[PDB]
């Protein structure tokens, strides 16, 4: 009437009063990443690999008006500004993302992280009548 694992854990059982079979799985457990600025009053929250609905319905019991789904997870107390890019950051969250702080909506900005770029020229690519266009100093 009991299902055991190779390590001696309970992963299933059979009830005696109804002859039904179930499966026991452990409940969720995780951490939270807090991005805090120097002179800020409240840091930004990130629940990695979690949807905002799941956090608000099972985990978060505090009223948080700012929330949106991102690639890393649910971000709290921040705005969605992935269309803007920067060259340097002090709070790198991962996967080419960053959190920027704007001096005084939420004062935190969730933007991308592009530390390197390539220089562009207005010259042509194909042969201009059999000759190439090269800029010489």
């Amino acid at each position: 009437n009991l299902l055991y694992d190779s390590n001696g854990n309970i992963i299933g059982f059979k009830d005696f009063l109804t002859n039904k079979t179930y499966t026991i799985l452990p409940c969720y457990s995780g951490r939270v990443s807090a991005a805090f600025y120097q002179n800020s009053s409240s840091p930004a929250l990130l629940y990695r690999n979690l949807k905002c609905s799941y956090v608000l319905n099972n985990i978060s019991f505090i009223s948080q008006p700012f929330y949106f789904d991102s690639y890393l997870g649910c971000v709290l107390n921040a705005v969605n500004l992935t269309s803007y890019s920067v060259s340097s950051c002090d709070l790198r969250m991962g996967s080419g993302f960053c959190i920027d702080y704007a001096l005084p909506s939420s004062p935190y900005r969730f933007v991308t992280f592009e530390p390197f770029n390539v220089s562009f020229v207005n010259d042509s690519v194909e042969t201009v009548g059999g000759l190439f266009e090269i800029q010489i100093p």
Partner: protein
């Protein structure tokens, strides 16, 4: 007498999964009586987290240095699209280029990088997918979710593989089109001809075999792409690294089932069978065992990250002195007859594509190391040999048999000739 072009692949490990361990959750997950004694130490978990953060910072600095070395001094054109690319001098580069302007947006890799990443499951996005598929009932007994529920989770790097792929595509394009930033302003076919002639091959057979070089390059690229379908020595390294990381994580997780001299390995039975005064000893023994295991793990991680730092330094050096420029060092980038090298994006590292000079047929020819001309003066060849054809001394290359008249561009002048030089007063400065 005849030659071809061979292609080789090489992988060098650069990155590593950023493993973060929650010491408090690993030791005293959901037991207050355990925390009341774990706080009596505190500094063990503090130092463990500090060492993990230092390792993560080292990995981030390494990735930033690699990105800087890949994107150092690159100049492209604004009017450069994917459609007007991937072909130069009858050499196709479709499987090695992506899109970086007026073209594709979100993550999109080259076909070669796609085939590379499709063979590896635990990639930079595989961990994220396996971690976000824990809630919902997708998997029943997934090991990664179990490790995450015990305080062991892997974090993604600060730079995604899409940016690395874009940097690699830019570095590859910088050697195909003007102003040829990766070739010091030299066109691709001219650079290939110079690299082949630097080995001792005459320029005539190179100018008369312009299509053969392109055909050999295409055949080598196709052979590499077909061989990547199987499991070569380059693809096995990533799998070995992933398996080693998984084995280390499993060995660390299995430490929660040891008794360490206690009555049981689980805190539930200890707290439901004995009183706290009778359970503090068992809790302390379990805490000591787990702390010793974590210390051994962080020491192993320090050793591994040192080795990875060394490997990444080697990889950065090879990228700087084999891909972005032609270094005058033999047996460094390839094997003797090195011509060109290309870089590609690989899981937890980079992929190198080396092209070499491979002869097919040979010929036994009697050569001479020097001739004593008239007037008691010495003449020695420059990267070549002196051959006699029809009772007349000629010159030929070291890597290719092609008789040509002797001139001032292939010999050196000496005011005295060696005694071991063959006497040839009939030949003069033609």
């Amino acid at each position: 007498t005849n030659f071809t072009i061979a292609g080789h692949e090489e992988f060098i490990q650069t990155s590593s999964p950023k493993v973060t361990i929650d010491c408090s959750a690993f030791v005293c997950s959901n037991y207050a009586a355990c925390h009341d004694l774990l706080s009596e130490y505190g500094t063990f978990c503090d130092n463990i987290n500090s060492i993990l953060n230092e390792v993560n910072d080292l990995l981030d600095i390494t990735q930033l240095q690699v990105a800087n070395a890949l994107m150092q001094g690159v100049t492209l054109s604004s009017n450069l699209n994917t459609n007007l690319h991937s072909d130069v001098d009858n050499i196709d580069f479709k499987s090695l280029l992506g899109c970086l302007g007026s073209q594709c947006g979100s993550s999109s890799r080259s076909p070669l990088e796609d085939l590379l990443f499709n063979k590896v499951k635990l990639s930079d996005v595989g961990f994220v997918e396996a971690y976000n598929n824990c809630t919902g009932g997708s998997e029943i007994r997934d090991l990664l979710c179990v490790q995450s529920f015990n305080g062991i989770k892997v974090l993604p790097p600060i730079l995604s593989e899409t940016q690395i792929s874009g940097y690699t595509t830019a570095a590859t394009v910088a050697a195909m089109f003007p102003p040829w930033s990766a070739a010091a302003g030299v066109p691709f076919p001219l650079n290939v001809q110079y690299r082949i002639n630097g080995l001792g091959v005459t320029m005539d057979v190179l100018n008369k075999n312009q299509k053969l070089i392109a055909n050999a390059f295409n055949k080598a690229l196709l052979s590499i792409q077909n061989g990547f379908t199987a499991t070569p020595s380059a693809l096995a390294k990533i799998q070995s690294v992933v398996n080693a990381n998984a084995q280390a994580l499993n060995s660390l997780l299995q430490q929660l089932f040891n008794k360490f001299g206690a009555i049981s390995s689980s805190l539930q039975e200890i707290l439901s069978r004995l009183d706290p005064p009778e359970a503090q000893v068992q809790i302390d023994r379990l805490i000591n065992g787990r702390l010793t295991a974590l210390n051994a793990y962080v020491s192993q991680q320090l050793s591994d990250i040192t080795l990875i730092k060394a490997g990444a330094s080697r990889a950065i050096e090879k990228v700087n002195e084999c891909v972005k420029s032609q270094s005058p060092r033999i047996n460094f980038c390839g094997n003797g007859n090195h011509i060109l090298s290309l870089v590609q994006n690989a899981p937890y590292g980079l992929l190198f594509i080396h092209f070499s000079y491979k002869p097919t047929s040979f010929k036994t020819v009697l050569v001479s190391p020097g001739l004593c001309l008239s007037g008691d003066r010495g003449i020695a060849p420059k990267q070549g040999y002196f051959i006699k054809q029809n009772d007349s001394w000629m010159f030929t290359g070291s890597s290719y048999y092609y008789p040509e008249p002797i001139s001032d561009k292939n010999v050196v002048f000496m005011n005295s000739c060696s005694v071991n030089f063959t006497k040839a007063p009939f030949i003069y400065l033609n």
